[PDB]
Amino acid sequence: TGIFMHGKIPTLKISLIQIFRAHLWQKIHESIVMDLCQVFDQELDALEIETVQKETIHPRKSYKMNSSCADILLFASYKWNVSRPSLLADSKDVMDSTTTQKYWIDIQLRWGDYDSHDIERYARAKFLDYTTDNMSIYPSPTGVLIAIDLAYNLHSAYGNWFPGSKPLIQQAMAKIMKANPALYVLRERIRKGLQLYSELFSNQIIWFV
Amino acid sequence: KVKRSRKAPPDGWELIEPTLDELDQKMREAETEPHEGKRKVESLWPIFRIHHQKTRYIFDLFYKRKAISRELYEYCIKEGYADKNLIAKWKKQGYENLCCLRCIQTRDTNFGTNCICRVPKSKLEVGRIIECTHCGCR
Amino acid sequence: MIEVVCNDRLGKKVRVKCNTDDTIGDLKKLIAAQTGTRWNKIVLKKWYTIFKDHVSLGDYEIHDGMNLELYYQ
Amino acid sequence: GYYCNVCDCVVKDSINFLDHINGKKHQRNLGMSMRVERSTLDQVKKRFEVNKKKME
Amino acid sequence: AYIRYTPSQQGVAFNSGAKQRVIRMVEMQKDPMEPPR
Amino acid sequence: WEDADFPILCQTCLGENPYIRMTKEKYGKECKICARPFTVFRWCPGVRMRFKKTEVCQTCSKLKNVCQTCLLDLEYGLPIQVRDAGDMLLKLARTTPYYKRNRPHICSFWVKGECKRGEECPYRHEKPTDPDDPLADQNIKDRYYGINDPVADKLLKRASTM
Amino acid sequence: NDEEEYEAWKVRELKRIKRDREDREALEKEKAEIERMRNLTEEERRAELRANGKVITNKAVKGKYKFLQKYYHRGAFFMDEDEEVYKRDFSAPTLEDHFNKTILPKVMQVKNFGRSGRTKYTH
Amino acid sequence: PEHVRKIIRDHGDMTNRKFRHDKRVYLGALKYMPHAVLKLLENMPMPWEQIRDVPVLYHITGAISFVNEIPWVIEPVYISQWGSMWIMMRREKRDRRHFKRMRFPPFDDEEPPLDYADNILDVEPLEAIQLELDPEEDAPVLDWFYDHQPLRDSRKYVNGS
Amino acid sequence: EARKRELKKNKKQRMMVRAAVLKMKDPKQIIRDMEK
Amino acid sequence: SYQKLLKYYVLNALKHRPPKAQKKRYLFRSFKATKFFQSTKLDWVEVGLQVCRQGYNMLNLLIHRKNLNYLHLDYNFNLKPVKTLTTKERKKSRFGNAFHLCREVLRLTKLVVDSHVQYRLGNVDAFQLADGLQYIFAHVGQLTGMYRYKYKLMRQIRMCKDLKHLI
Amino acid sequence: MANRTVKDAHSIHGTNPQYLVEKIIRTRIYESKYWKEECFGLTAELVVDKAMELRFVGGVYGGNIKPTPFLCLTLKMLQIQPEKDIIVEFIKNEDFKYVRMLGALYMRLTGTAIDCYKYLEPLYNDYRKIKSQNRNGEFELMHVDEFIDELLHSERVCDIILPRLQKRYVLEEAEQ
Amino acid sequence: KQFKDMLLERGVSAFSTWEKELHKIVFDPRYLLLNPKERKQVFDQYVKTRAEEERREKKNKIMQAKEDF
RNA sequence: CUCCGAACGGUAAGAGCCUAGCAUGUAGA
């Protein structure tokens, strides 16, 4: 998970491999994919959705940074008008684009440094790269490259936007960057290594045998 | 193999022009020939032969037939058409006709530097078998 | 204006001075004009992170001193 | 993943398996398939017949 | 950083007239383009 | 690591000519059976012979009583296995040593079918002897040691048949 | 559109045929242009005629290095193309030339434990 | 004469054309005594007489072609030549407006430049920067000023061959 | 300075010990014999 | 520049002690005496292309013998990789000592020979040729990879710099 | 095994039998999807079947150097090294287009310049469309004249570097 | 002659292709009078000839009008 | 006021499966 660095620096290397004990970024990718799946399953018919179609990604699809596969493949309802590719912070969106029937989401994690603060820039860059890259498994042409900076607790996204979902994904990322379980485990491991000590919900009628 | 000499050719070059260019065409054909079929050095056998015949012409024009002028027995050697040292080796009474070095004994070169037809015709080609390693001249 | 280092462990350590809001195409053009090569053969990686020739330079967040592994196509 | 019954080996990456049976010493042991160039007429029959099969 | 050698081994009728078998011994030219073999 | 003056040669390996011409090479070719630099000299045993050379080094051959290029013997002419396991050797040996060793080995271009050199093949134009008998299969190191000879058993059973 | 294809096949054949003859005559045109410039240099005008442009492929519009800004070499490998990427006036501070390098105490060439060189062009 | 052109016809093969047997000395003595970059760096073809001949000693396996020819240019003739060249260069720089001489790296990734120009070479523009001297003041240096060796067949002004 | 070399030597010894432990109880040495 | 040139001139003037030694040791004079050398007459551009091809084939066979199928010299004497090997291959390609300098020298030589081959093959062919050689020695100052193997080269490159402003 | 042609090949004088293409590009050609299939062996006949079923004419596409099947098939025929008669048969085929394109490209890479003009010149009449893959992946429909013009006059019309054909003037002055 | 004549009577173009003009002639009885090889030869000669007479008839009209002027 | 530098100190070590450019030329019967 400790994606990369520059120089040898054995101390920080041991520090980072200790900060990630188990397959931890795999856990974060699973957690955030399921968070997006639940946010989609909450309002499915309201967004002209067809079904949560979380695609079988490779087991190291979260650690590999050369390619970019589709984390989830939303099937829209019918004649789903896609807007132009833009950012998440901009409000003047352009709804004059094509109308696709498949909508891909690929969550990326970027353990950034001081010269990697801007997650929006890295996000749109990886978006344009994966889009133009004629080498990756990539079903739908319209989607989003929502990226998360774990080294500064940043969130960004740049891609083709849904009609009436931009604020939905905005609120979902605001509620996922906060109160996330694996994210909390990251924060706890970092506080411990850094030494700076400062089904539950029902409403579904489920049973267990 | 004519490229230039920074001057007009001598008086009677027009007569040697076609015969020289025939041998030059043969040389250009043997120089771009394929290696397939040449065992180790067979590809280098005919080229020396092409160097033989060429001189064997101009020498006959030089002072044998007495047909070439004083210019067309030195100018051809000044530019690359023949070999001066080779002709001088032919000027001797012993080495009348023989290739460069394929059969001679230990000369200044450890393999040979004297001749290729230098095998003695009495006992040359020991028993019956005649062959050479550079020119292949029996 | 940014100074980038197209470097390699094979006797090719070039330093190209390129613009801030420039592309990667013109950066490849500079790197090819400087060292020894044409424009369409160069490839600037950073640990298998292939830089494409349509994204911008400041958009990929490169800054003064960033060294990039040169590889020929 | 991929499975080779001749060598009874498990090929992981699709490309890893593609680069075994094409070059397998054991599979090559089932027959030497060094392809010699057919005659000049042999390459004409394949050109002619396909012109009458694909098109016609 | 010639030689004359009597073959005292077998001389009876090998090499008809196996008298003393003189030979010539030269050295072979070392080209100065050969690394340590 | 091993220079000398004259080779410890055979009487048949030298050749059926009273005057041959050797060519010494200081520190050539790396001895076959001990891997040591020694002094390679070749010669021509006779007309249309094989241009025989020197394989087994001076200490290699002097220690084990054997010639520098055939590994048979300087005293008898038998192999080094018969002359160890097996006297009988004196009636088993031969005088007038056949020069069927000093001849060129088989032209492989002829065995394939197209020997381009024609009559000028400096190799030999006979049929490649069939592979099946273990006298198609001997090597140097198994020969030079007593262990496992294809020849020495076949000549050692010539010693008790008749 | 077969009628249009044969019409353009001559459009390309004319240009390709025009490039051949235009390349042959260029060797004579270049020699002839030197002959025209020869008489032009001979008896056209004593400093009274140019008929020129002083054309250069890539104009190096340099500036002024501040105090010790590194001597950046553009690299002379590709200049016949006249690419616009070259015309950028490489006279700017790259990494550390942003400073004044005059308020410093005495001097600081390179603090990297390698100052083999010693020169500033004072003399 | 043409033994070299055919000896170069084997640049590396699978024991097909002098590959294995001639491999090690085509590497060893090739790398040990390079020494020909120097000679080529000491035998410029003299553009004022760019018809250079360059006699060369070559290895039979085709390892290196060494140029044993040392140049022996004559001092005052040399200096006068390069001065006349200086004048011509100033003239061509002053007359010509547009200057196409940015010809940088040739070939570019695996075009070997040897194809029909180290050969019969139908093109031979040996008239590069030769100043047209009028035979009214440059008479005595009229015929021996743009020959690369203007002494050879003299026997009066050249001490020897 | 030398502390880096000392730590590298300690890490190399630990890696050799781990490799020997994984090879002694290896599937091709231990579990392979356990199945025999 | 004039100051640097005068400095080189004077420092050469001091270190000029009368050379008289070595008993006239000559090279490429005994080589011609053996059977491993043959004299001929071949045009200069031909000899240059021959030397360039020979040097390239010598380096390529060094790389071949050394079991490195993932590197390529690229025929301009600029060593290029193939697949970006980084398991243990990059540790087996850290030459830096002589391969680097031989590469730089042969690159300079083949570059001069190519500049002269373009002449006979239809280059500008005017004073452009001499301008090419001038900027080629300039690039040998800068463009060539000479700096790494030896740094004292900069001294003469400084001369090649200062000498520029002499002309 | 993709080392030798079959057992022996007449080496083109340029670089080598298989190395007329750059080492990087050929090394990329091998490891590929299109190479994995059809690498079992293609001597003379199946090459024609694989050629008539690929309507692309291009070299490399994608940031990662991805060879087109056109380019990989050129390399496959280059390793096979067919006789000149088969190549003239491919150069004489007017029904199938890209087969003739490959034949011309191979005759350019391996063949005499005299033969190059003698066999490629009459391919300078067809005014038909030909599809090609650009370096960015996007395709483009061009004219056959553009292809043969870049092939005979220009250098590296595709990813491959061409082996330095003479200027036509020297041959017109010396030969036909 | 009948096939040559139908090519003109059915308005086959000299600036198009065989495959693209075929729908013009296939129903015509005279189409059955030749095999494929003969069809190709007559067609090729009709196309070559009609294109050449057309271009030449235009170049002539302009040249004649220039000359009269 | 134009003087411009490169390598090492660098990429943990690992058990199961798989593919390959290269090399001898001989002694002897």
DSSP symbols for chain A: -----SS--HHHHHHHHHH--SSHHHHHHHHHHHHHHHHHHHSSGGGTEEE--B----TTTTT--S----SEEEEEEEEEE---EEESS-------S-EEEEEEE--EE----GGG--HHHHHHHHHHHHHH-TTS----SSEE--EEETTTTEEE-EEEPPTTTHHHHHHHHHHHHSS-HHHHHHHHHHHHHHT-----S-SS-----
For nucleotide M2, the protein residue with its alpha carbon nearest to C1' is G71
Report CB contact under 8 Å: J135, G75.
no
Q: How far is the CA of G79 from the C1' of M2 (A)?
A: 21
- G80 vs G89: CA distance, rounded Å: 18
Please give the DSSP secondary-structure letter assigned to residue B79: T
Report CB contact under 8 Å: B111, J35.
yes
Q: Which residues of J touch C69 (CB under 8 A)?
A: 84
* Single-letter amino acid, residue A17: I
Terminal Cα distance for chain D, rounded:
42
What stretches of L1-69 show up as alpha helix (H) in DSSP?
2-9, 18-21, 36-68
CB neighbours (10 Å) of residue H129?
A: 20
β-strands A147-149, A108-109 pairing: parallel
J142 touches strand M (CB under 7 A): yes
Q: Which long-range contacts (CB under 8 A, 24 or more apart) does B116-121 make?
A: B116/B48
Q: Which residues of H touch K11 (CB under 8 A)?
A: 13, 16-17
Torsion, Cα B110 B113 B117 B121, to 10 degrees, reads: -60
Q: How far is the CA of I25 from the C1' of M13 (A)?
A: 16
* Single-letter amino acid, residue B110: N
Both structure tokens of A157: 């996204």
- D54 vs B19: CA distance, rounded Å: 57
Q: How far is the CA of D16 from the C1' of M14 (A)?
A: 21
| Beta strands across the sheet bearing F19-28 | E3-4, E22-27, F19-28, F38-42
I32 touches strand M (CB under 7 A): no
Burial L24-58 (b: 16+ CB within 10 A, else e): bbeeeebbeeeeeeebeebbeebbeebeeeeeeee
Report CB contact under 8 Å: J94, C45.
no
Strand partners, F24: E27, F41
Report CB contact under 8 Å: A135, K136.
no
Measured CA to CA in angstroms, residue I16 lies from C72, I21, L31 at distances of 38, 9, 88
- H103 vs G80: CA distance, rounded Å: 7
Report CB contact under 8 Å: H6, B27.
no
- A148 vs G43: CA distance, rounded Å: 76
- H62 vs E31: CA distance, rounded Å: 13
Task: Please report where in the chains the tokens 């000093």 appear, as a residue.
Answer: F102
Q: How far is the CA of E33 from the C1' of M27 (A)?
A: 29
Report CB contact under 8 Å: K166, H115.
yes
CB-based contact, E34 to chain J, within 8 Å: no
Specify the resolution in Å: 7.8
Whether the CB-CB separation of C10 and J80 falls below 8 Å is answered with: yes
Whether the CB-CB separation of A76 and A101 falls below 8 Å is answered with: yes
- H65 vs F79: CA distance, rounded Å: 51
CA distance K32 to chain A (A): 12
- F56 vs F61: CA distance, rounded Å: 6
- H86 vs L32: CA distance, rounded Å: 83
CB-based contact, B31 to chain J, within 8 Å: no
- L18 vs L23: CA distance, rounded Å: 9
- K15 vs K110: CA distance, rounded Å: 11
Query: Which of J31, D10, A29 lies closest to H63 in space, CA to CA?
Result: J31
CB neighbours (10 Å) of residue D13?
A: 10
CA distance H95 to chain G (A): 7
Report CB contact under 8 Å: J72, K22.
yes
For nucleotide M14, the protein residue with its alpha carbon nearest to C1' is I19
Subunit partners of chain I (3 or more CB pairs within 8 A): none
Nucleotide nearest to J150 (CA to C1'): M6
* Cα-to-chain-centroid distance, residue I21: 5
CA distance E9 to chain H (A): 37
Measured CA to CA in angstroms, residue A60 lies from A35, A64, A74, J83 at distances of 19, 6, 22, 22
Report CB contact under 8 Å: C34, G86.
no
Nucleotide nearest to F50 (CA to C1'): M26
Task: Please report where in the chains the tokens 């035979």 appear, as a residue.
Answer: H135
CB-based contact, C64 to chain G, within 8 Å: yes
Q: Which residues of A touch C61 (CB under 8 A)?
A: 115-116, 118, 121-122, 125
Strand partners, A105: A72, A144
Query: Which of B111, H12, H24, H42 lies closest to J28 in space, CA to CA?
Result: H42
- G108 vs G115: CA distance, rounded Å: 10
CB-based contact, G115 to chain H, within 8 Å: no
Strand M neighbours among G 49-88, CB < 7 A: 62, 64-65, 67-71, 73
Report CB contact under 8 Å: J3, G123.
yes
* Cα-to-chain-centroid distance, residue E23: 6
**Collapsed DSSP state (helix, strand, coil) of residue K78:** helix
Across chain J, the runs of DSSP E, i.e. the strands, are: 38-41, 71-72, 80-81
Strand M neighbours among D 5-24, CB < 7 A: 7, 9-12, 16, 19-20, 23-24
Helix J44-65 × helix H23-32 angle, to 10°: 110
CB-based contact, B63 to chain J, within 8 Å: no
Tell me the CATH number for domain A1-197.
Answer: 3.90.1570.40
β-strands A72-81, A99-105 pairing: antiparallel
Which residue is closest to H9 within chain K, CA to CA?
Answer: K13
* Domain range list for chain A: 1-197
* Single-letter amino acid, residue G22: E
Which residue is closest to C56 within chain A, CA to CA?
Answer: A125
Is chain C in touch with chain H: ≥3 Cβ pairs within 8 A?
A: yes
Nucleotide nearest to J97 (CA to C1'): M7
**Collapsed DSSP state (helix, strand, coil) of residue J36:** coil
Is chain E in touch with chain A: ≥3 Cβ pairs within 8 A?
A: no
Q: Which residues of E touch H28 (CB under 8 A)?
A: 33-35
Q: Which of G73, G90, G95 sits opposite C64 (nearest CB)?
A: G95
- B99 vs H50: CA distance, rounded Å: 34
Report CB contact under 8 Å: H33, E32.
yes
Please give the DSSP secondary-structure letter assigned to residue J63: H
Which residue is closest to H6 within chain J, CA to CA?
Answer: J50
Both structure tokens of B72: 């067309």
Both structure tokens of J90: 């990059």
For nucleotide M23, the protein residue with its alpha carbon nearest to C1' is H20
J141 touches strand M (CB under 7 A): yes
Burial label, B75 (beta-carbon count in 10 A; 0-12, 13-18, 19+): middle
- J123 vs H50: CA distance, rounded Å: 15
CA distance K138 to chain C (A): 14
- H82 vs H85: CA distance, rounded Å: 5
CB-based contact, K10 to chain B, within 8 Å: yes
Q: How far is the CA of I18 from the C1' of M14 (A)?
A: 9
Q: How far is the CA of C51 from the C1' of M12 (A)?
A: 29
Is chain B in touch with chain I: ≥3 Cβ pairs within 8 A?
A: no
Nucleotides of M under 7 A from a protein CB: 1-29
Total residue length of chain I? 36
β-strands E22-27, F19-28 pairing: parallel
- A199 vs G119: CA distance, rounded Å: 74
Rg (CA), chain I: 15
Those residues with Cβ within 8 angstroms of residue F7's Cβ, 6 or more apart along the chain or in another chain: F22, F39, F41, F54, F58, F68, F69
CB-based contact, G5 to chain K, within 8 Å: yes
CA distance E10 to chain H (A): 38
Q: How was this structure determined?
A: cryo-EM
C7 touches strand M (CB under 7 A): yes
CB-based contact, C66 to chain G, within 8 Å: no
